[PDB]
Amino acid sequence: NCVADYSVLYNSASFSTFKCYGVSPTKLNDLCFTNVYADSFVIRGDEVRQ
């Protein structure tokens, strides 16, 4: 029951995202989705393909 705005990744710094961006890449913010459940985990990130 929220907004789930994407103002955080507008400017950002580097990053790679999920590399799909099906609708409006780098714009998004057009679909509501059920929730923004974000599990807590940290990885090295070099093996981003896996």
Added chain:
Amino acid sequence: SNLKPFERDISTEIYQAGSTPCNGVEGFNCYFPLQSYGFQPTNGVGYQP
């Protein structure tokens, strides 16, 4: 953006990934489109050419 099926894009223009203009020269938010794999004999299981 993604390509139409059976396309061949040989453009070498620089990328402007942000609001900062690139003016056709490398810099912040200005990354070259082409990168080389660098194939060498001792590569991984799924890294050979």
